[PDB]
């Protein structure tokens, strides 16, 4: 068994670039906040390291934080839609059918998506979009300020990620 | 033993169609918010599958979320009234006598009804209303905004459901 | 084995001098709130005692409290940057890469930084800045009052510290 | 404790950048033509680690290949001088004091430079033209001897500290 | 189950078409000599057998013969390019990162390139296949009587491996 991933990395979560999303009171329910394709490029670590290899296996945990104050109430649905289903047919009711975790903007704790569907990972080359299991978040419930004159408020949100302990790389490639 | 239900389904909760209910400050206490008859048709899954069969046995867990912000205080009573008792005689005090769970609109966590009364399920054909153990929710306590000028606020609520591990189907029928 | 540190000290946390920092709504995200170099001088205890010795080994736990009321939402990043990386290149995204713990201003509980990286401590003389593993805190998320007319509010914060059970002193020196 | 570097590097060699040196006939004896700092940056893969990681411990095994017609006569002197002593004022004789090996430009088998078993001011390594190169019957001054170097890390290399990529 | 190809082909080697490459002293190091993609088309016998079998499995042993006298001094490096990485700007410095074999122009006996052991592949143009390419590692310099142009000629031939076999039968097209 070969594991070139530092044990510290798997035990810590690091913010992913382009993982910053904002929720506004004018966002209609069901609107797509952020649609980031799960992959090693999310973590700043394993992006530099991934240049060594081309094929990778396993999953990667993702957790999201909502920096939302009280007086604003709403729910955000996070669904890991399998590839190919992304189209206008997607709706709030249908989103929950895929694996998901319900989150409240008022929560003061990180939310962890249950992306444990290893389903016997086959292969993932870093040159194709095939089987890029995407993550999409939508405003499950309309956002209201409860008459707190806080219309000019945006619920800032950030997403971190850490590699799974089963993560590994197969083939070596020279750095580009 | 035959269990044609995916183990993932029983381990996950999915929103039920027509399971969206709203609570308004003008709702008098004891008003019926939603009265949905428990059955396989609640879950989007087991509705397509139920077309195969006609008779089903077992119970199905139901949990409700209240997307309510602070500054509004109230309580909602959920009672699984046995069939035949639905009439004007029903009142807030009498509702709690049946199995129930008390919920607070300010709660930030899902509420699970204790619908564990298997009581040796007899049979349930999908052509009759007999023994359709209904679920009714009422405003246990009057809703007040605590002078937060949030009168134009509605506590959005959604209900999910998952099949019980004991759920099963008896007889096969061709799809319609 | 010689341990001249009182067992009570390691089991209790004491406020550190100059460990008071304030967060204002005008603080732009990424601004450095406080940058205190970890060392025995943080704790009022072990400062008088450190006069006896010159070299010390081990780490020291640090926890921070945020005396912040509701209606204000924000996140503060605490990163123990290794020495030599302090410069303009530091940014919010890069800060999380080092060991860190995410904190919410609304939290009502002390936050403990995971400064468990003993990494086989080598030596630390009390006359040089070498390997003075610093602690830096930055406003991870912009601070907003949610229209609560609380602009004239500052989130007071204090930091305590206790010596680790592995803390020890090597060489004796006369008091100065 | 863990070994981030893949074992494939341990059992195989790879050329290093700036390791191109040609023993031109118009070169005075003792002239410097191949100077390396003996650091992790030599191996292309190891250079990649230094971008991410900070602390490195261990040693490599430097291997040198020479292209020889089996006719031209010449020798190269390799001496891994300790850090600090190295400077411009370093005659060929002085380098002979430190550990060294003598190689012939006509040697088919590459020479394995001996390195003592073991960061800043690291141990250095320099090479000079011990003996001038002559065709000896080639009647041509355009001929040159190509030289390539590849460093393979020893099976004890590892890192200590963690740093964001830069 | 039953290997169709006769054992005679296995015991010998066949020159693949367009397997001829030329090395000249005036050719500076940095220009590729020949690009090869492993497949049944390399062996003419296997090329005609593709009609009877759409799917082929196994590997092929590839050997290279280089002709030259004892005066020349040069080295030839054979580099393995993983699929999907080939680029126009393929210099020699990074060409040795992949597994390779060291060879010289003064060799007499043929040198066998080490091929990694290894899934059924259809007859379509599936780019996923082990690619082979050689690069002029060092310049070819003559140490004799100033040869104006001593063209070093080499030939590449491959034969089916013992494990090579066809699994799916398809009538000839």
Numbering used by the authors:
A (entry chain A), B (entry chain A), C (entry chain A): 48 to 223
D (entry chain C): 48 to 165, 176 to 223
E (entry chain B): 48 to 165, 169 to 223
Article sentences:
Noroviruses are single-stranded RNA viruses that cause pandemic outbreaks of acute gastroenteritis. Norovirus capsids are made of 180 identical copies of the VP1 protein arranged in a T = 3 icosahedral particle. The icosahedral asymmetric unit contains three quasi-equivalent VP1 monomers (designated A, B, and C). Each monomer associates with another monomer to form P domain dimers (in either A–B or C–C configuration).
The design of cysteine pairs within the shell domain of VP1 monomers can lead to the formation of intermolecular disulfide bonds between A–A and A–B monomers. This, in turn prevents the disassembly of the particle into VP1 dimers. Because of the symmetry of the norovirus VLPs, a cysteine pair introduced near the strict fivefold symmetry axes would yield disulfides between every A–A monomer pairs. The same cysteine pair at the strict threefold symmetry axes would yield disulfide bonds between every B–C monomer pair. DS1 VLPs showed the characteristic icosahedral symmetry with T = 3 arrangement. Clear densities for the formation of the interprotomer disulfide between Cys116 and Cys193 were visible around the fivefold and threefold symmetry axes. In summary, we successfully designed cysteine mutations in the GI.1 shell domain that resulted in interprotomer disulfides, stabilizing the entire capsid. The resulting particles showed increased thermal stability as evidenced by the appearance of a second melting transition at 75 °C compared to a single transition at 64 °C for the wild-type particles. The lower temperature transition corresponds to the unfolding of the P domain, while the higher temperature transition likely corresponds to the stabilized shell domain. In particular, stabilized VLPs elicited a more focused immune response toward accessible epitopes, and (in the absence of adjuvant) the development of blockade titers was much faster than immunization with wild-type particles.
